Amino acid sequence: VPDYHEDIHTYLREMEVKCKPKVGYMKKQPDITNSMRAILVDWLVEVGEEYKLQNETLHLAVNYIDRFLSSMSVLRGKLQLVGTAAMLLASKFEEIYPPEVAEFVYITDDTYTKKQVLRMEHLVLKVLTFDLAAPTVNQFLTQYFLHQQPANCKVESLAMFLGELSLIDADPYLKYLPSVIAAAAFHLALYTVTGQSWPESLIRKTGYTLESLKPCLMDLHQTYLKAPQHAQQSIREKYKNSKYHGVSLLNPPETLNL
Amino acid sequence: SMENFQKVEKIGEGTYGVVYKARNKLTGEVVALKKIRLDTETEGVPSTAIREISLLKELNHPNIVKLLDVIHTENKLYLVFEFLHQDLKKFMDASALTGIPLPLIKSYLFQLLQGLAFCHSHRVLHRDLKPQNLLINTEGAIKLADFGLARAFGVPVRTYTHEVVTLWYRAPEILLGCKYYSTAVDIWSLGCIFAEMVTRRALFPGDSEIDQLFRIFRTLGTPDEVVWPGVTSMPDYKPSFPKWARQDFSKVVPPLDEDGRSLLSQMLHYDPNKRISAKAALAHPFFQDVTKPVPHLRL
Numbered sequence: 001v002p003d004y005h006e007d008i009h010t011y012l013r014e015m016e017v018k019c020k021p022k023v024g025y026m027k028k029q030p031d032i033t034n035s036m037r038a039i040l041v042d043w044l045v046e047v048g049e050e051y052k053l054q055n056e057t058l059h060l061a062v063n064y065i066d067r068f069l070s071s072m073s074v075l076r077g078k079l080q081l082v083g084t085a086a087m088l089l090a091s092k093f094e095e096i097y098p099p100e101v102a103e104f105v106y107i108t109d110d111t112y113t114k115k116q117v118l119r120m121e122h123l124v125l126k127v128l129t130f131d132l133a134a135p136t137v138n139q140f141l142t143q144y145f146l147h148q149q150p151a152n153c154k155v156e157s158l159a160m161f162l163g164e165l166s167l168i169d170a171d172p173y174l175k176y177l178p179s180v181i182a183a184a185a186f187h188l189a190l191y192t193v194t195g196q197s198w199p200e201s202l203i204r205k206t207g208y209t210l211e212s213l214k215p216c217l218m219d220l221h222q223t224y225l226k227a228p229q230h231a232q233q234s235i236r237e238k239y240k241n242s243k244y245h246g247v248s249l250l251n252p253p254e255t256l257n258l
Numbered sequence: 259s260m261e262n263f264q265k266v267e268k269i270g271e272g273t274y275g276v277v278y279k280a281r282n283k284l285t286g287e288v289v290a291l292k293k294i295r296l297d298t299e300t301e302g303v304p305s306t307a308i309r310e311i312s313l314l315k316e317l318n319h320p321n322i323v324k325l326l327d328v329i330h331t332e333n334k335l336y337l338v339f340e341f342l343h344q345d346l347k348k349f350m351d352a353s354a355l356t357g358i359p360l361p362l363i364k365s366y367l368f369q370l371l372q373g374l375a376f377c378h379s380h381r382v383l384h385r386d387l388k389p390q391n392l393l394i395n396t397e398g399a400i401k402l403a404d405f406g407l408a409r410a411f412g413v414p415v416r417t418y419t420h421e422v423v424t425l426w427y428r429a430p431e432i433l434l435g436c437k438y439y440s441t442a443v444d445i446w447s448l449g450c451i452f453a454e455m456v457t458r459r460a461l462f463p464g465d466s467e468i469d470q471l472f473r474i475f476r477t478l479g480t481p482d483e484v485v486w487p488g489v490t491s492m493p494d495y496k497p498s499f500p501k502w503a504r505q506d507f508s509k510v511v512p513p514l515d516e517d518g519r520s521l522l523s524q525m526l527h528y529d530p531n532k533r534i535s536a537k538a539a540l541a542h543p544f545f546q547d548v549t550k551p552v553p554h555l556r557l
């Protein structure tokens with residue numbers, strides 16, 4: 001019931017379309033692949049955990065990276081520099097206490113200099129034209145959570161976990177908007193923990209039905225089932241923590257009954 | 259490019275950086291330039307600048323100062339803003355003799371509420387509303403400025419920076435260390451500003467946090483679980499707080515009419531949840547006869 005909640009949701013629905021990366025950018029990147037990107041994002045998850053950064057910060061950074069790569073060709077040797085600068089900008093935007101620049105330099109194991117990280121920051125800002133307030137899967141999730149009855153920690157944590165998994169795999173998740181991924185994640189989490197489904201009240205708020213979430217849901221369910229075998233495991237490790245109610249230890253449903 | 263700007267004079271300092279009045283030589287447009295030096299960083303582009311620019315670019319509204327451009331020179335960042343003639347604080351000081359005409363106080367508040375409702379609708383908290391950051395022009399407009407301390411919020415909020423809002427205008431929930439604060443804190447500030455426009459003196463001029471709380475308490479009464487459920491559980495609440503009786507608003511701002519006092523009381527509600535939103539305040543009977551007259555003094 002926080003006021004403006006509907007105004008804000010509507011505004012984020014508008015902005016997410018404007019902040020969307022180019023769905024097919026990776027095919028146009030001569031020297032980088034989905035796998036390289038997955039490795040990068042999985043590393044940023046670790047960084048986030050190491051410096052106890054907000055999940056929001058992680059989501060923002062990934063959005064900055066994808067938009068940057070949507071318009072700038074990058075050699076593989078510089079991918080991590082882009083990611084590092086993105087995480088620094090996300091932290092400055094979103095954190096109460098962002099890590100200092102030296103800390104971001106230090107986590108690249110001295111692959112880059114402080115000078116490089118700062119120049120890249122500037123380039124990233126120019127390329128994104130300072131438009132850093134991007135809607136995230138996380139932002140839509142926290143809104144959707146308000147529609148639980150009653151609120152359930154496992155559901156909330158599992159939803160964030162699933163939403164986070166989608167960050168790793170540009171194929172297929174670059175094709176879905178944050179609000180849709182969040183929808184699939186919330187439903188999937190809800191169904192796993194409680195047996196319940198995308199509630200009537202979120203159909204009213206979002207216009208999304210289980211039918212319209214179905215394609216993203218089919219993908220996410222598969223991602224969920226295969227998570228233990230994914231090359232990247234940092235999110236699973238993160239979500240073993242009591243902080244997130246150990247939801248990565250939960251067993252995914254075998255079927256969804258769509 | 260800076261080559262198209264002829265500087266006129268130094269206006270002062272913002273929340274961060276230095277402000278100049280300047281003129282676009284080609285279009286004639288008069289602007290304010292906020293210079294942020296990067297040569298003394300060291301830490302790259304300051305978070306305060308990153309937020310101000312990202313947030314202000316989204317917020318196009320007649321009662322929010324317009325960010326026109328951002329120019330990167332060798333080692334400098336220049337924010338180019340539309341120029342306004344004066345801030346509210348200096349205007350109030352100028353109005354020491356005659357006071358500020360009711361229609362103008364009413365127009366300004368109405369406009370401030372519009373600007374703020376637009377920020378909040380776009381998930382932005384200002385977090386430093388004070389007369390110094392509220393700018394007026396010769397045509398009767400007033401606008402929110404200096405978004406150096408602003409931030410984008412989420413629904414529902416999580417814990418944000420505790421050290422926010424200039425003390426005199428700081429909400430009780432911040433003073434008491436609530437883990438969460440939201441749009442209500444800006445409304446509290448506007449209420450203090452409403453009162454200040456009527457009396458031309460700060461409503462709660464504390465010189466420390468505890469002094470600030472006690473001034474609030476001595477005016478609005480010491481809050482209890484009835485007026486503000488949860489107040490005695492707040493992190494910085496103390497059972498030893500003196501217990502002051504609440505005084506009639508007719509005594510808090512004696513010149514104010516019944517409608518004005520009604521609105522002010524709702525903007526200064528202790529409980530953030532009960533405190534009126536900028537959006538709802540627009541429909542308050544206080545504004546039934548609002549117009550938009552030019553300032554009564556030359557700026």
Ligand SMILES: CNc1nc(C)c(-c2nc(Nc3cccc(N4CCCN(C(C)=O)CC4)c3)ncc2C#N)s1
Binds near residue numbers: 273292342391393
């Ligand atoms: C409080 N931080 C601020 N940041 C900016 C960028 C400000 C700003 N200021 C103006 N103009 C302005 C503001 C306050 C006072 C005055 N005065 C003082 C003397 C200078 N002056 C002349 C003609 O020389 C006018 C009277 C002017 N306009 C836009 C912004 C913005 N954004 S305030």
